[PDB]
Amino acid sequence: MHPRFQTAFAQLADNLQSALEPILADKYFPALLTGEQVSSLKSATGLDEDALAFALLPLAAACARTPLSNFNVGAIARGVSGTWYFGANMEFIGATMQQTVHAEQSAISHAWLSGEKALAAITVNYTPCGHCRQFMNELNSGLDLRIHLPGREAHALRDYLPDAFGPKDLEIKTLLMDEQDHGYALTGDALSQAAIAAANRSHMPYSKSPSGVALECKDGRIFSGSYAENAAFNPTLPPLQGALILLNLKGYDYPDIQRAVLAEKADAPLIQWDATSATLKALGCHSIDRVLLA
Amino acid sequence: MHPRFQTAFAQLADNLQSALEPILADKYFPALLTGEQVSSLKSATGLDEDALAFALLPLAAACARTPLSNFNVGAIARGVSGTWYFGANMEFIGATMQQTVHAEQSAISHAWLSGEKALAAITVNYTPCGHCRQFMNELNSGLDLRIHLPGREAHALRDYLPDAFGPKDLEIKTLLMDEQDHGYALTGDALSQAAIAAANRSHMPYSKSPSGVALECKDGRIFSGSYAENAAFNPTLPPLQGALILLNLKGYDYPDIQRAVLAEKADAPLIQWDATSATLKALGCHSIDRVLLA
Numbered sequence: 001m002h003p004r005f006q007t008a009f010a011q012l013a014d015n016l017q018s019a020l021e022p023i024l025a026d027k028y029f030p031a032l033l034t035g036e037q038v039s040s041l042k043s044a045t046g047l048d049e050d051a052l053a054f055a056l057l058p059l060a061a062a063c064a065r066t067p068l069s070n071f072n073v074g075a076i077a078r079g080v081s082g083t084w085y086f087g088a089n090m091e092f093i094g095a096t097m098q099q100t101v102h103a104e105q106s107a108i109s110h111a112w113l114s115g116e117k118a119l120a121a122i123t124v125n126y127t128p129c130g131h132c133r134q135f136m137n138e139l140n141s142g143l144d145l146r147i148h149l150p151g152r153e154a155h156a157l158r159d160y161l162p163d164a165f166g167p168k169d170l171e172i173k174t175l176l177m178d179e180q181d182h183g184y185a186l187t188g189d190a191l192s193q194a195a196i197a198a199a200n201r202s203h204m205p206y207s208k209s210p211s212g213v214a215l216e217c218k219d220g221r222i223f224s225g226s227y228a229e230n231a232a233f234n235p236t237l238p239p240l241q242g243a244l245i246l247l248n249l250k251g252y253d254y255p256d257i258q259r260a261v262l263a264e265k266a267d268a269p270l271i272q273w274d275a276t277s278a279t280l281k282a283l284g285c286h287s288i289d290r291v292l293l294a
Numbered sequence: 295m296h297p298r299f300q301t302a303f304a305q306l307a308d309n310l311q312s313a314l315e316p317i318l319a320d321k322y323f324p325a326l327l328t329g330e331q332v333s334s335l336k337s338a339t340g341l342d343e344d345a346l347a348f349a350l351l352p353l354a355a356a357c358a359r360t361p362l363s364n365f366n367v368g369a370i371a372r373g374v375s376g377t378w379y380f381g382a383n384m385e386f387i388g389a390t391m392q393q394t395v396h397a398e399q400s401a402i403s404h405a406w407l408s409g410e411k412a413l414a415a416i417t418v419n420y421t422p423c424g425h426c427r428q429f430m431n432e433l434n435s436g437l438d439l440r441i442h443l444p445g446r447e448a449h450a451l452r453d454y455l456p457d458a459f460g461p462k463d464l465e466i467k468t469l470l471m472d473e474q475d476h477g478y479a480l481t482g483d484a485l486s487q488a489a490i491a492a493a494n495r496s497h498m499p500y501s502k503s504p505s506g507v508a509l510e511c512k513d514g515r516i517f518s519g520s521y522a523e524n525a526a527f528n529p530t531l532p533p534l535q536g537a538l539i540l541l542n543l544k545g546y547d548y549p550d551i552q553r554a555v556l557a558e559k560a561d562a563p564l565i566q567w568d569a570t571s572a573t574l575k576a577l578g579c580h581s582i583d584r585v586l587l588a
């Protein structure tokens with residue numbers, strides 16, 4: 001078991017510990033559970049889906065990286081496929097408050113990046129901030145997404161964001177998690193191609209600036225992040241954060257990032273290069289290359 | 295009249311145009327109205343405060359800088375003093391979506407930076423995004439701040455952000471717009487001292503990293519911005535944005551920024567230097583110095 005899960009797991013109910021212990025055995029447990037795995041957990045405990053999601057929030061919160069706040073928040077995004085994706089918040093010393101990722105952004109990006117086509121609900125152990133309510137309104141699930149919070153009745157997103165602003169207001173009809181492929185040819189080495197492929201999936205209807213970052217670990221594992229804009233602009237998830245969300249949830253740590261590549265257009269109205277370099281250098285990576293899309 | 299106001303003013307009601315025309319005569323009208331001025335406007339038109347604020351939103355929206363969206367939004371923050379501060383959204387080509395300022399952030403920062411101690415209401419011509427609802431919950435006005443939107447009943451912030459996250463959740467008791475003075479000695483030239491004084495007012499309870507940016511214009515006018523953190527971290531207003539909000543609202547343009555200074559601690563957990571330099575270079579300023587606080 002990856003040590004981050006040790007105390008969380010110790011606090012779990014006996015029959016749940018028993019059902020999970022095979023799954024969490026592996027140090028690189030992918031912070032995700034398939035439909036088959038949630039069925040097993042339900043049979044071993046008698047918990048229904050919403051109660052199981054709440055019981056599991058301590059393992060999601062165990063993936064939080066919180067050097068400034070020490071306020072660990074876990075979220076679980078339940079895909080329409082039946083897969084459950086964990087998510088946790090990350091704060092980066094040496095960067096700015098704008099580089100923070102929230103537990104909800106982590107869980108939704110985990111699902112989108114894994115190829116999930118839509119979400120049915122998200123369970124979080126603390127009420128969503130307004131920045132994440134706005135993030136969630138970018139999704140193809142719209143205001144109907146169900147939010148589950150400890151000790152409250154479930155509600156759709158429309159209840160947490162009354163009289164909402166979102167894509168419709170700027171006449172945008174392609175929503176985050178819809179099928180997007182921008183068609184750039186992949187070139188370069190493995191890492192450059194991962195970065196361009198990530199850029200090909202980006203949600204960027206407002207600036208039309210596609211980008212993707214790919215991180216190569218010391219053991220050769222690659223983690224890629226696509227750019228996801230938001231109608232309120234600032235809740236946008238930068239490309240780097242996607243890659244870092246996956247790296248952390250899959251069991252790795254910043255010390256084993258070996259090199260990174262950012263792919264983007266040179267003439268794009270928004271430029272990710274400076275924030276990507278700066279945050280990666282703050283994390284200790286110094287091998288950052290940029291690939292240009294055409 | 296500063297040309298940005300020309301079409302907006304032309305669309306105004308005759309008795310209102312008459313009352314405003316002395317005020318808007320000056321090219322450097324400070325995008326603000328004193329209590330005495332709103333009284334005059336009420337006597338000249340018969341409008342009450344809320345209706346006057348709505349009638350004036352076209353002049354606030356006229357200060358928007360929107361190269362990506364062309365979606366101009368104006369806001370008017372009504373101080374507890376009786377002064378009304380305009381605010382408009384700004385988007386910066388060559389930067390990232392995280393550098394955007396919303397009309398609400400612009401109007402609240404205009405008030406805070408001008409020395410306003412608290413707000414009574416804010417009027418916006420489009421419903422607030424969740425990022426700004428969270429920004430507004432940082433204020434000493436809390437969830438009681440009144441939001442006025444065209445064609446809707448006024449509501450407190452608690453109605454737009456049900457089951458809100460905010461300072462209380464992280465045990466913070468000093469709120470934005472409360473009296474803060476961090477006590478750094480001012481040194482250096484006029485610009486360095488402006489930057490350190492701005493840093494002395496910053497709201498930074500979560501990272502304890504004070505910062506302030508000061509911009510010197512070609513005619514020697516200085517504009518300073520203090521750093522304002524937010525409990526949800528990402529809605530934080532960077533120091534640069536404060537300075538740029540004031541520069542734009544007071545009638546200037548990016549071409550006349552001559553040099554800038556950023557003041558901050560070297561050992562602070564969050565660092566503003568890279569995003570400040572990058573965005574200012576995107577705007578064309580290349581003379582950026584950093585001053586260290588001790």
Ligand SMILES: Nc1ccn([C@@H]2O[C@H](CO)[C@@H](O)[C@H]2O)c(=O)c1
Pocket residue numbers: 066069071073089090091100101102103104124126127128129459525526527
């Ligand atoms: N519902 C919440 C509330 C806060 N946070 C985060 O917790 C910390 C303090 O706000 C930051 O990391 C921020 O992203 C969450 O992710 C989820």
Ligand SMILES: Nc1ccn([C@@H]2O[C@H](CO)[C@@H](O)[C@H]2O)c(=O)c1
Pocket residue numbers: 165231232233360363365367383384385394395396397398418420421422423
């Ligand atoms: N109520 C709103 C809605 C959107 N915006 C902004 O309008 C643009 C498109 O979202 C961006 O500049 C963004 O900051 C506002 O400021 C106010």
Ligand SMILES: [Zn+2]
Pocket residue numbers: 102103104128129130131132133526
């Ligand atoms: Zn959040």
Ligand SMILES: [Zn+2]
Pocket residue numbers: 232396397398422423424425426427
């Ligand atoms: Zn906003």
